[PDB]
Amino acid sequence: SLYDVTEWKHVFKLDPNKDLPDEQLEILCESGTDAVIIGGTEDNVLRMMSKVRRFLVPCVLEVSAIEAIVPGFDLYFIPSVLNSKNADWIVGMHQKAMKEYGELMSMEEIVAEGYCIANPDCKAAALTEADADLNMDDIVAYARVSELLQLPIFYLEYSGVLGDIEAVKKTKAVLETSTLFYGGGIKDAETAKQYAEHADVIVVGNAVYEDFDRALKTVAAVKGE
């Protein structure tokens, strides 16, 4: 399959408001990555989607604003930020999407994406009013919440830093239905492989803009040559 997250191992997450050269975008789409996730305006989302769709790789929209939903993606990931103090980041995005765009929601493949933002010092933590200063125990508990709800994805999110490997391990131990996505600080093959021991899917994001060639090697590191 292509669109079953249960078989994935590696995704790149791109920021549509950041600049990536066409050539690099091409190479990334052709890298063997299991999906390209567009995530971070309707116009910049549309432009980047139209570029990625020239390739065979699954293209995913991580929906962070309803105003910026565009047709044409293979999958739509709608985050529930389980440690948000604001209901609109937990089920509000879903409800708005269903109320405003019910017919679009019916025609596309939508995935509820459990989210735990575990890095208190990132923008998303601020933006989602996340209770992000979490213990190991707190994180495992959020993971069990995702598994009780049978959310298809539990995305453990440290954004630009490396999260505690033990917390990834202990999170994985409580998940079965939930596919474990880890993102945070993955910039090279050695670290990608380290986190791939426990995460089902490793997410490589801002490293692509920081050192492209190095970030590129994360696919083979996690998927084999």
CATH 3.20.20.390 fits 1-225, yes or no: yes
Q: Write down the experimental method used for this entry.
A: X-ray
Residues annotated in the binding site for Mg(2+), as ranges?
A: 15
CA atoms within 13 A on the CB side of 88: 7
From the CB of residue 87, how many other CB atoms can be counted at a distance below 10 Å?
9
Chain CA centroid to CA 188, Å: 18
The one-letter amino acid code at 124 reads A
* C-beta separation of 39 from 62 below 8 A: yes
CA atoms within 13 A on the CB side of 63: 32
Domain residue ranges in the chain: 1-225
Question: What residue ranges in 118-209 does DSSP mark as E strands?
Answer: 153-157, 179-183, 201-204
Residues annotated in the binding site for sn-glycerol 1-phosphate, as ranges?
A: 13, 155-160, 185, 205-206
Per residue in 92-102, is it b (16+ CB within 10 Å) or e — as a string? ebbebbeeeee
* C-beta separation of 63 from 89 below 8 A: no
**Long-range contacts made by residues 118-127, C-beta under 8 angstroms, separation at least 24?**
118/156, 118/157, 118/158, 118/163, 118/167, 118/184, 119/157, 119/158, 119/159, 119/160, 119/161, 119/163, 119/184, 121/161, 122/158, 122/159, 122/160, 122/161, 123/159, 124/157, 124/159, 125/159
DSSP β-ladder status, 35-38 and 10-14: parallel
- Specify the resolution in Å: 1.9
Per the listing, tokens 């890095």 go with: 119
Per the listing, tokens 């309803």 go with: 66
Residues annotated in the binding site, as ranges?
A: 13, 15, 155-160, 185, 205-206
| Residue 84 DSSP symbol | B
Per the listing, tokens 């879903």 go with: 94
